[PDB]
Design a protein around this nucleic acid. Structure first.
Ligand SMILES: [Cl-]
Lengths: 60, 63, 61
DNA sequence: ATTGACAGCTGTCAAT
DNA sequence: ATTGACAGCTGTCAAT
C-alpha cells in the first residue's frame, strides 16, 4: 500500500484540478517530490484516480 | 525403461505448452532454451513435445 | 535515430514466426532485447506498433 | 468491492 | 507512405 499521507496530497491536487486532472510533466515531478512517490507511482495513481476517485468528486 | 521425468521440468514444459497452446511448435532455439531450463536433451524435448501434442494439448485447446 | 536494420530484422522475423499469439513473454521480450542490443522498452513499443501495422499485412497468407 | 500496478491499445506526433 | 515514441486509456490482476 500507499502512504496514507501521500494520497491526501494527491487527492487534494486532484480536487483542486478536478476539471483538468492532468498534471504537467513537471507537476508530476512536483507531486512526486511532494509525495515521495516515484513518478511511476504518481502517473499510475492518476491513471487509477481519474477512474476511481474523480467521478465521486465531479459528482457535486 | 527410463523413469518418469522431473516434476519441475514437466511443469516447465507443460506451462510453455500452455503459453503457446495455439502453436505448440518450439523452434530450434526455443527447444534449446527449454533444454537448459529442464536439463533435458533435445531428443527428450523433441519427443516430450511429440507426445504432449497428441496426449495433453487437446485437453488444453478445449479450454 | 532509427533502430539497426539487423535489430529490426530480428524483431520482424520473430513477429512473422509467431503470428498466432504474436505476444512475446517477458523472457522472450528479454531475449529480443539481448538479440537486438535494444532496451526491453524499445521492443515492447516496436511490437505494440507492429501488431497494428505489420500483422494485418502478414496474415494475408 | 478496493487498491496499486502493469500490459497492451488508442490516438497522436515528429521524423523519415 | 513509414518510423519510433509516448501520454493516457482500457482491461485486468492479486490482494483485499
Ligand atoms: Cl479531498
Amino acid at each position: 500500500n500507499l502512504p496514507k499521507e501521500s494520497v491526501q496530497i494527491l487527492r487534494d491536487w486532484l480536487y483542486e484540478h478536478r476539471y483538468n486532472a492532468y498534471p504537467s510533466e513537471q507537476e508530476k515531478a512536483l507531486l512526486s517530490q511532494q509525495t515521495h512517490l516515484s513518478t511511476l507511482q504518481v502517473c499510475n495513481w492518476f491513471i487509477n484516480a481519474r477512474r476511481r476517485l474523480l467521478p465521486d468528486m465531479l459528482r457535486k
